[PDB]
Amino acid sequence: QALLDNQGVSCNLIRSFVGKGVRLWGCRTLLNEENTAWRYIQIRLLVSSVEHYLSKLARAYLFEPNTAPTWMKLKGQVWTWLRQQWLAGAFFGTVEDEAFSLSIGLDETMTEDDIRHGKMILQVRLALLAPAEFIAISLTLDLRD
Amino acid sequence: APLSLPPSALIAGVYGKTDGERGVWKAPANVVLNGVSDVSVRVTNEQQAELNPKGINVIRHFSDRGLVVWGSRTQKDDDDWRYIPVRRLFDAAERDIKKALQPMVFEPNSQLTWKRVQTAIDNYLYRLWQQGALAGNKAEEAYFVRVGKGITMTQDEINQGKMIIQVGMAAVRPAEFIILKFTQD
Amino acid sequence: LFDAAERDIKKALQPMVFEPNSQLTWKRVQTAIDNYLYRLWQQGALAGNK
Amino acid sequence: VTSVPGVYIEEDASPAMSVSASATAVPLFVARFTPLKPELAGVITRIG
């Protein structure tokens, strides 16, 4: 009955069930916290592989020129790729527009200073799913005469 | 036996995280010290009231989140600079424009040089304004950089070659002492 | 009628008997007396017209 | 009044008042009686 004090950081409990096997019973990171989307360990790790996937193609576009058409070349790619992935149900939202959003542009990410610093900058948006952890049942008899 | 340590070493590293994601203009208080057992002497709230004037800061201990730094006030207490970020915002904005005016330090003092300098300073505070670091409203009133000859100068200090850059900002203050004051209506 | 209308307002001004004599106290008292005679008017006890 | 930064809580207090009516009834009678207990000799007593 100790560690039930939620003043120190969270755990992952493991429980042996009766009519089914020993079921895993914890996924909520040691950010012992209610609002940051950095509990729910799969959320931490889903982004990181996409980070790995976008770094996978970032080094391809390495010594580019700073032109707006050259931005558009990447802009088709990610819009292509994550669309599938949101349509693979990996992401939130019933439209793609609320799924992921891109914001590279002239002073939307960059400026001429970063053009003459050769920076190549993009803003990456994503809305978030959630697992359905708990069962808040309410009943209503509804007399019916 | 555990050895004591003056905290001026590990408090330098916590300034390296705040300028990473949040920037310079955020006071480091809610940042959590990463890896320590306990403070040497336990301070309480009734002598926090005495030590928060004559401004010196304090390492606090909390039950739920552990040790945390607390207070972001500098030494001398006029309303000019009482806060760490308002001091460190003017200290970093000067060092970036002073390093790039050093290539142009012997150019002639005509009028086309004046409008080229006044613009490159204008496009530096505007980028810094629209990322939430100058406490101005939706007007322009955060900078008044002027370099003219009728304004801000006159003829006789041109002969002892000078330039005058009157520039001024309006920094943002940290929000402490949040007061609710509920009412009935 | 005058004997009962005085005894109800005198009993409730007794909690506010040492408050400052500024202007925001004046409009709060003048209203709580206004909403007492208006309720008593519209139930047929003050002989005034419409 | 405020030294430790923290967060402070505060409410607005006011004696804001309204008036409600009582009843004009329930007198007292000062006739002679015969009480049963000696503490009922000379003190006001509520009868329901």
Place this chain on the structure above:
Amino acid sequence: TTTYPGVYLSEDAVSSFSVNSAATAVPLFAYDSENTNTINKPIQVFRNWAEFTVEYPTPLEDAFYTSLSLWFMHGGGKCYLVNEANIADAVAQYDDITLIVAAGTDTTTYTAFTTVVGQGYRIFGLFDGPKEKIAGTAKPDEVMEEYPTSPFGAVFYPWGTLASGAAVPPSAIAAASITQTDRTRGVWKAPANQAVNGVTPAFAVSDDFQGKYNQGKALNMIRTFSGQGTVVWGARTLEDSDNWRYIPVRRLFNAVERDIQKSLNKLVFEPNSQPTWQRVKAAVDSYLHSLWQQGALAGNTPADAWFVQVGKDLTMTQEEINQGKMIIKIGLAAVRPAEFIILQFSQD
């Protein structure tokens, strides 16, 4: 910085917030430190019936034993039990305590109660009625001044004597009504018609001795009826004030802010900027609006049923921004309990 050529990366920095709701009933129980048939550890930190029974398999008849029996008969929660000497201490520690019972302990209790409200820690205590049988012929107020006035408390006279066992202070008994109130529905609902089980009042009180003590202060006797049996009865704080009568509307604001004041502790040392200010406003109103659409607070067009205001000069002007201070303010429409019922006929 961007030193070597290559791929650098940034992310989102800071997010929104909302409050985390409540506990609404963490009672410490008034352990008597002089008492011996018990753990002379003053503070008992108790979770449910099980560790209680491994503590007390021993059927006592002292009121705290009858309390946690009754308390955990209604479910009950992680409820504590500190002596009459260590009230303020764990309150300064445990930051959850919502309720303060009277286990027949008054003298140092009321002082320690009025001590901490002298620093105002946002709790609702509640007291015992006097022991037995006011004659009611006279003496109408001289049974009350023994209890400190506050917007925080009531006494609940009849000493629900719990005919199974020993005479139980109705501090313990009315808490069971609350225990099946928050479990039923929240705090703004008045625990005034929850009926308790197997507890008998010592006295079947009155309607008029009831009615003549409905005013002045917060007697709030607990009367058995037909249908509803041994039910709680009457809801009113100690002052009969237009701001504070009706204990849930007091307890509403007792609960309305300890979530909020807690929640925003993470949010200090922050750049006191205009886009901060609007954003802070943006989180509360919806949580209010939910709570309004919960019907916890009264009032249509709910920005009428509250208001909210924070800015640069309507609140928190220049130099105290320069002093670091921010001030905000709200005010709101709440419900009031329909305590009284009259009804009018006409033949038209």
Place this chain on the structure above:
Amino acid sequence: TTTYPGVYLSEDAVSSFSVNSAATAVPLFAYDSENTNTINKPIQVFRNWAEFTVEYPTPLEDAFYTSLSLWFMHGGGKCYLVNEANIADAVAQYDDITLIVAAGTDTTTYTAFTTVVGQGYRIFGLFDGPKEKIAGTAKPDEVMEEYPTSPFGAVFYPWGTLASGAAVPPSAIAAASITQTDRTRGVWKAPANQAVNGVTPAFAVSDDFQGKYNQGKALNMIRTFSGQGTVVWGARTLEDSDNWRYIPVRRLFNAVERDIQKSLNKLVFEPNSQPTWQRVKAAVDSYLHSLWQQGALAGNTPADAWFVQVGKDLTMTQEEINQGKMIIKIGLAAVRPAEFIILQFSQD
């Protein structure tokens, strides 16, 4: 200087300034020099209830032990405790004293009170009353010449008795009413109708014995009503002049200057020129405008409520500028309590 070529930079010389609010309540108490069950240290500093218990483990019966236990129980804060021979030293050092109360000392206390008034330290004491039972047959004046006539202080007669323990001197009862007043709603409101808890007066005074002691001097009885109980009653200082009555209008002027005098210590030796005169004038009225919206000082068109003026020939002409003097004058009209409420009926 401009010795070598390169890039120089200067910054601003002077910045803005403003005043910080207040503390409003730091009392020092009246120890007794001949007392035995105590420490021989003259000056003690107590900050809250915690160290007071570890210093004094046993409950005593002396007048100072019953006084601090009544201060902390109604909230309270940082309070001192000095012997009755060293008030004239302790006030001149600690720079935050507001109240000089008397915990059952009269003879040698009245001399040390009027001492620190003689240097003009801007302090406000408060005294005890006579011991027991003015018979009321006669003699309205002969109980009132043993009290030093000054616009600082009151007497607070009826000697509350603290039904838990022994008697309490009424300076502690009056000092507890100020603590829950300035924390609740300002200092301009009188410690007048806020109730205290746990203290009953030993006597029942009258309705009319208040009447003959309301003129001349300011007995300010402590009287218990129905409903609200054991409340203080009457806020009047020792003189009857139309400038200095009404204890809250004294403490308003007493605390509106101890924050200006504290702030202007960093503005001396500044050049007595034109940009100084338009900066102090623009910094004082920005503090009064924050004080006018809060209801402290009454008046519409807030140019009518106060005035501030500073110049070259309206005040401080040319010859006394050459001596260095910088004289100003500000004047403001505060609020006064509505001690008497008369109401007129008519027919129209």
